[PDB]
Amino acid sequence: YFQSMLKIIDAKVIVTCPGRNFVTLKITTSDGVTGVGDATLNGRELAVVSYLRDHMIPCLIGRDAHRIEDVWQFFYRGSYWRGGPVAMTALAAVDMALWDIKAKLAGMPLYQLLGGACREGVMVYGHANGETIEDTIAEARKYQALGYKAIRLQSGVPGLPSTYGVSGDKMFYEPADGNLPTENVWSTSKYLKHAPKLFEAAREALGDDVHLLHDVHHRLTPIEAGRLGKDLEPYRLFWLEDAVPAENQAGFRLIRQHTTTPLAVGEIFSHVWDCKQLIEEQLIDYLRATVLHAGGITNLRKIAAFADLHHVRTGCHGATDLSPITMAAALHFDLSVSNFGLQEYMRHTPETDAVFPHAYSYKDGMLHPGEAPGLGVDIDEALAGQYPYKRAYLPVNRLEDGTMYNW
Amino acid sequence: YFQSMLKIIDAKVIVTCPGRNFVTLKITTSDGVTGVGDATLNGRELAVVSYLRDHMIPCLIGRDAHRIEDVWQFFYRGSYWRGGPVAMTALAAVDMALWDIKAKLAGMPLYQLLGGACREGVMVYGHANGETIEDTIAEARKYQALGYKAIRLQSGVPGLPSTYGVSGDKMFYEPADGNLPTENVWSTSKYLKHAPKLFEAAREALGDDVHLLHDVHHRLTPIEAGRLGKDLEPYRLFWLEDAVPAENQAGFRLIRQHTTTPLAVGEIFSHVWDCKQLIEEQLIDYLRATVLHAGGITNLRKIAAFADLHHVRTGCHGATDLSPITMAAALHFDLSVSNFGLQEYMRHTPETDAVFPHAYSYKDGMLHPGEAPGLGVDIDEALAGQYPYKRAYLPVNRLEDGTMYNW
Amino acid sequence: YFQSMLKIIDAKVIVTCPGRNFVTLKITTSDGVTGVGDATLNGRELAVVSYLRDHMIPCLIGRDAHRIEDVWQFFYRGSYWRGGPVAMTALAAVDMALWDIKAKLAGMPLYQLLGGACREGVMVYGHANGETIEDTIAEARKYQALGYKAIRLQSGVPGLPSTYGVSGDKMFYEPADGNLPTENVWSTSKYLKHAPKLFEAAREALGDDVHLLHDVHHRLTPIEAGRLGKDLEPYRLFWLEDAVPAENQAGFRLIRQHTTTPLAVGEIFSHVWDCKQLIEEQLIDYLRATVLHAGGITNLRKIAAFADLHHVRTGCHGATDLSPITMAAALHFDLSVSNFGLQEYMRHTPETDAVFPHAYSYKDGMLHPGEAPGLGVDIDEALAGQYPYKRAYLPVNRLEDGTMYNW
Amino acid sequence: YFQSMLKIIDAKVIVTCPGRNFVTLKITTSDGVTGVGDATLNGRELAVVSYLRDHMIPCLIGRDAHRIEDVWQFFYRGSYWRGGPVAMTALAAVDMALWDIKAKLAGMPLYQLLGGACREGVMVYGHANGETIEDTIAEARKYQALGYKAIRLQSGVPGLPSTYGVSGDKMFYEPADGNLPTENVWSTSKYLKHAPKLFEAAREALGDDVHLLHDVHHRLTPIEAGRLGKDLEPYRLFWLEDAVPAENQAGFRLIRQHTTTPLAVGEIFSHVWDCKQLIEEQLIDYLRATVLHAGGITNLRKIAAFADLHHVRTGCHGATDLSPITMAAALHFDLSVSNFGLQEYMRHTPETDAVFPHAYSYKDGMLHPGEAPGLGVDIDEALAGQYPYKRAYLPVNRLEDGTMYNW
Ligand SMILES: [Cl-]
Ligand SMILES: [Cl-]
Ligand SMILES: [Cl-]
Ligand SMILES: [Cl-]
Ligand SMILES: [Cl-]
Ligand SMILES: [Cl-]
Ligand SMILES: [Cl-]
Ligand SMILES: [Cl-]
Ligand SMILES: [Cl-]
Ligand SMILES: [Cl-]
Ligand SMILES: [Mg+2]
Ligand SMILES: [Mg+2]
Ligand SMILES: [Mg+2]
Ligand SMILES: [Mg+2]
Hints:
This is part of a larger assembly, with four copies of chain A (about 400 residues).
Chain A: E1 8-16, E2 22-29, E3 34-38, H1 45-60, H2 68-78, H3 85-106, E4 122-130, H4 133-145, E5 150-155, E6 183-186, H5 188-206, E7 211-215, H6 222-232, E8 239-241, H7 251-258, E9 263-265, H8 276-280, E10 286-287, H9 296-307, E11 313-314, H10 324-336, E12 343-344, H11 350-355, E13 361-363, E14 366-368, H12 381-384, E15 396-399
Parallel strand pairs in A: 4-5, 4-12, 5-7, 6-15, 7-8, 8-9, 9-10, 10-11
Antiparallel strand pairs in A: 1-2, 2-3, 4-14, 13-14
Helix pairs in contact in A: 1-3, 2-3, 4-5, 5-6, 6-7
The structure holds chloride ion (10 copies) and magnesium ion (4 copies).
């Protein structure tokens, strides 16, 4: 035998909007084996397109496709300016595509390369939202009837025109809805009094077996989050998510000091450095970082092993802005990681599913990555060409006095 | 006078199964004085048999039997690969047997060498289990009627086919029941809601004088354990045991931060290094490490003196898989240690008692080691020969999704 | 496609002594694909044989061979008594054999599953020993002439009959040489004055390009190690190894405080818990834990990712008591791990190489795992049968006054 | 068999001055077996006499002599006002006498009850003092010629009439020489410049094999001690003792930060609380606390086990004001403790040896406790009656300006 080099002979970025924007990388190797990776960065999509097309891809051509770790370190260190959502999301696409290729050459679904199956499927949660508590609870009943064992509840705040998680969309939430960003208004005090009522009513209506989750969406200070967690303790939430802006990781110390409600954070994190203190101080229970926005399978696996030393479990973000390619990768990761916690699942539109055909599927409150070789996913480029990019921004949020705040 | 060397002239390992597996070491010295030690490691018994027969014993022959500490350091450091349950359990058998010999030469029950009696007897707890709370409480009444001042309560979790501590055995629990390991299924959420009801009903039925204990059996995360401890505070438990897997000792910081329910851990520990942080940070109230699995009388005494600097008391593990030889040693230790907390007591079968005749006995919620010279215990080798080894494993435990978990 | 279960249909333990004792596990799957793992625990070999044969293997038969992580967690948690050198070495054999199988099914050398190659080969060091400094330096010149870029130097201590690393063996050191353990005598003060002279002369003779290493072999206290490190600073050692017994991990704080000589430790570690504090406090530069004694490829990879957060690099132990099966596994690991530091290499005897035929090879100061599918190694069972087990112990070490000490 | 109570039927305190003051406790049990303990508190002797005669002894009469630990806790907790040199020295006499009795009943020298021998004898150091460096070195040569492997050096400080350790006594130092306390004058600056010259010359004259020690005698601040330790590093002292007054245990942090010279402290300590921080922070290498002044065999053993977790070794104080009864006890302790470091040995006068006949003896730089049953020591009461108490105080020390300072 000889070392086999499978050269990368081509790599391209495809942009499509089958209901929302998605950016995809497709790598082709010498013998025609291809791999794809998601590179979608909601609301800043084209920055990642240029990062890939104009800078990374020309360095990728002609490389040995087998050298996954080396390529990862090459782009991570070689950019000189290190990390960040654009670079790490661009790197995630490369990593996903190379692991797709690796598993195809091995003749196995990717999870078999990552340690094999640790569970029979991946528990998911869906998204119950409504303008009132009553509407939110009605939506949650539908998720129960659908076999979901875990449900995130989000309700409008009385006295506020809008809040995170509440829209006309039922089976998903699709926030990037402005040709310019939608402006929202916020009151912490109104929200803090209301949230516990939501869960009080929800437990009464829905019973104790179902797992209930809530996303604070970055809107509190640590002492307010400690209070909110404490008020929510009687309802035993599965997690309370993104309670406070987390750049200052020590901010979670006060929360942890004042409540036993479990804490989750990090859908926006792009590297281990965004959560190292959170994890090593046991300040959170679930890490929400994803293969898409934190640098691929390669990096998320490393982070998850670190998390497992500190009683932290995975709770990967799963909003519609992560394409089916991310979902495939995420599911191979979730099926094989020992310290799995929960997987978010917002349904994509039928058009998105058709552009990104995949083997994964839902059954009885669980997703499963399927048994096809590779990620078990691809892009239909002809169909993708029928849905041109359309600019869309995430909303922003301001205080009652106009102060710029967190959405 | 001259230094007297009492040479070890023989040492052998006897395996017997008078109801369950037991491994025993018997050392003979030049003048015929013998000592025995327990070497039983539930579910991995024969690994310790080989560790002793094939490696340790040949180094033991011809040594001065008086040099207890030196022999201890010889095997502990000399194995090169240090500690671990197999090695420390093997070393525990040696240490117990040498202390048996030492006390016999001194003409005294062992506790007289270890500082003398500090109490009139050793308070014990027994094991009330039942499929329902009602059955568990009925079992606890029987223990009260038997004079037990302390009782561990364990109840089935509704919606779960089985849980730790609950079986058809009443006066004891005998888990190693599989020719292969029994698989169990687990739900933390079902358990967390149920456990407090058990103790609410138990206090109402049983009154406030009796000490009530609970064994979580490794199944929670620190934040869940903090919650469970908090929910149990109104019932004033004597201890809440093995709340979380303890390899990461800092994990107990969150528990201690959120509850005043007293904490116990460590039946599986094999050395001081498994609990040094727990003790020095005052993260626990009772250490459950035993003479059998943490390296004998010599080492447990050292650990207990360290524990006494930090308000930690002994709460030695006492399941049926510790033979009467361990029980004898444990009782000499418990009677003489100043910072004694409680001793676990599961009754052995009549056949086990006959194979291991002993002076210790139960009366009015207490055990006492007896006044015979030595440990006050021996093995009847002829009777032991009538009960051949039979393979039996401890159960395992998995989450609802198949994830490998803690039993 | 369907989930493919490749059942384990057989597993056996083979013991052989082609120059020294080796224990091997061989797993056979339904279609005849086999994998092997090393289970050798120097000086306590047969304890691991029984741990595997009598307890683990019967649980292994009929399992899905693809489920590597699940099997790992099954044995690690399921033993109930957790970790320890016997259990983790037994588990390492299972893990190595399953990864061998996985890579064979994938049609790839194992390193391709673990991230691909990160380097063109694996830098090694050899072992220069001699009774005097002059003899040690003469031996080091031979290693230089052999293309070794890194060399460990160990010299006799004047006034002491023997010391670690110094024997009649030149291309390797084979300590387990007693039908009972050889007793050695030790003086720290003689050693502390002498070691720096060794390296002073060595730099003068050998130049500055070559990497020089030293193994303290557990013999100092932290303040003595700080002094020794300081005295060695002018000679810029690659690492100073096992300076102090490391059960108390905080012991390395004083060393780190007083010297910039790089530190390595952990050939004896069996799990991440033996080094978590060392790593997270940046108290060491190289972790010496191995796939053999710390629970296989699966676990060492996890530990290495943790190490990479803290500037720690791998420096895997490589003495002759790790069989060629471990070496193969270690090399696949070393080639693919990003934070590689150095690999120890003691040459095996020709008879050992013949019993364990392998693809890895040495060239110009580097080893390379080779490109065969799997680990690239196997056992020749017929030849192995010609070399029956022969009992052999590691030496022990005592102070000048007889006190039991560290070898 | 029945529990045997050996009642204490009498206990008395004998005061004698065979060269210096000694206080002794003698306990008699029902069958005539007796035990003795030292209660000497240099310079405050009669306070301990009254503490015993007037308060403790009447509570002792009629107690079970076998209950060593219980008696210890009885006096330690029961005094209400806890610890202190008077109470703990009084308690030490009781503990020594009870352990003497216990070993006599067992028919063994005491070390056999405390774990057996860990070494062939107990390394000691003697006391070289002189007015000049030259005289000090001349005295050290005599100790070498006597087979001492370790020697404390103390020299006069030029420009100062006197300093600690320097007197007309050669084989010992006998400071309590005032019918009122002798006043001394002190200059730290003169001392700091001089001490390193002493050891520079001493190494040159005496060679590198011999262990050299120095007693700072409480006279520096931490930053000065750090400097002195640093200046002494080239001469590799065995220890630097009592560098700073140690009530503030954190004071040793600065020393440890600035020097690798090993540190010893604690001849004056009366309980574990005087050194818990020193030990747990690894701020010292040798604990100097003794069986006499820190509460007997029972308590020193506990402290030594704690010390062994932190790389601390025993370095028991051994000045002439500890009677041969303490020396006997100390030697049984030193022979049997695993983490032994060194034992101080100042020779008693011939008259003292005759009043306190004993089995221990010196040979080749070592003491050995002997093989007689018990402590191997007694008091000759008739001879003791020939040497009436004579008041004698320890010296005091003041700064050049009159400021009260530390002797
Ligand atoms: Cl493109
Ligand atoms: Cl509402
Ligand atoms: Cl046997
Ligand atoms: Cl082990
Ligand atoms: Cl019930
Ligand atoms: Cl076999
Ligand atoms: Cl030499
Ligand atoms: Cl009197
Ligand atoms: Cl006092
Ligand atoms: Cl002078
Ligand atoms: Mg969110
Ligand atoms: Mg338990
Ligand atoms: Mg080594
Ligand atoms: Mg002194």
